Amino acid sequence: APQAKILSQAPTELELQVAQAFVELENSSPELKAELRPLQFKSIREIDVAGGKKALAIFVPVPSLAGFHKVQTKLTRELEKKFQDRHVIFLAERRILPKPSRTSRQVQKRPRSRTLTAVHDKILEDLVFPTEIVGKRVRYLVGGNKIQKVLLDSKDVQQIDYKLESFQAVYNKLTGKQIVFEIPS
RNA sequence: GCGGUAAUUCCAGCUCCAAUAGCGUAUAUUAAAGUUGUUGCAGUUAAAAAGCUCGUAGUUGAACUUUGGGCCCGGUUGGCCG
Numbered sequence: 703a704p705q706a707k708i709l710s711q712a713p714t715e716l717e718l719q720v721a722q723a724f725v726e727l728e729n730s731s732p733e734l735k736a737e738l739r740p741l742q743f744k745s746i747r748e749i750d751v752a753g754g755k756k757a758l759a760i761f762v763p764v765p766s767l768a769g770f771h772k773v774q775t776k777l778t779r780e781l782e783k784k785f786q787d788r789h790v791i792f793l794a795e796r797r798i799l800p801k802p803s804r805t806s807r808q809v810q811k812r813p814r815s816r817t818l819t820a821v822h823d824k825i826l827e828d829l830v831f832p833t834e835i836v837g838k839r840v841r842y843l844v845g846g847n848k849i850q851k852v853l854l855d856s857k858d859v860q861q862i863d864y865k866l867e868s869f870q871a872v873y874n875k876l877t878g879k880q881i882v883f884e885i886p887s
Numbered sequence: 888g889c890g891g892u893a894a895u896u897c898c899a900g901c902u903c904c905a906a907u908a909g910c911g912u913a914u915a916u917u918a919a920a921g922u923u924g925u926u927g928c929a930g931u932u933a934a935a936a937a938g939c940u941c942g943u944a945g946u947u948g949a950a951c952u953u954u955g956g957g958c959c960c961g962g963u964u965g966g967c968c969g
Contacts, residue, residue, distance in 0.1 A: 750966085751966095752965055752966050753966085798953080800953070801952065801953055801954090802952090812952070813952090814951080814952060816952090817951095817952045817953085818952075818953050819951085819952070819953085843962080843963070844962080845961080845962035845963065846962080847962070847963055847964085849963080849964080867966095870964095870965085871966095874964095874965085880963075880964060880965090882964090
């Protein structure tokens with residue numbers, strides 16, 4: 703049973719469909735299976751897109767992100783292909799530890815890898831996964847609101863030019879901040 | 888500052904001003920005085936930047952690390968519709 707095997711937890715129908723897709727990809731087999739057998743995800747989050755589609759957020763343990771990062775292209779192509787009406791993307795379950803206060807207090811202090819801002823920055827880096835961000839800008843709007851511009855490279859934006867709003871909605875839903883992307887020319 | 892022959896200031900007389908049963912004088916002090924400066928001084932030339940540099944105390948010193956209630960308010964994007 704490489705179905706509930708490859709997550710590493712029982713639920714649920716979405717993740718199981720995904721796992722059986724993984725399995726059907728593994729059955730390719732040779733080059734795909736070779737690096738797709740160790741790569742397991744943990745959970746999935748299906749959420750809205752401003753258009754019609756939904757968006758798959760595939761959560762990961764983050765020692766697997768390397769092999770996941772080697773592929774991403776073929777998993778996003780095949781999963782978007784099979785599970786249509788969707789925008790697929792993988793992400794890493796990064797633990798956020800709370801900020802030390804006088805009430806709450808923790809030994810094994812709190813490295814900056816585990817802080818919130820870093821985790822949020824990395825989430826963006828994985829949403830894009832390709833296309834090394836050229837810049838970030840943050841407008842602070844007079845209505846006390848905040849928006850982040852993320853400046854992308856023109857290379858390989860064709861692969862994700864149809865996912866921007868989904869990424870925006872995702873980051874807004876998880877992190878709570880508004881978002882926009884941009885490519886200089 | 889007045890005053891050396893016809894003194895608007897001296898000495899008297901007259902007239903008048905202020906304060907008033909209190910007034911003046913002298914000294915010390917106070918704000919005035921941002922003329923001792925934390926607020927708040929100054930330093931080309933008016934008094935004052937060490938001949939210049941290092942340097943201990945001293946003074947000072949880049950940026951960075953997630954939030955419980957509820958109500959109202961209005962923005963700014965998003966869709967859903969145009």
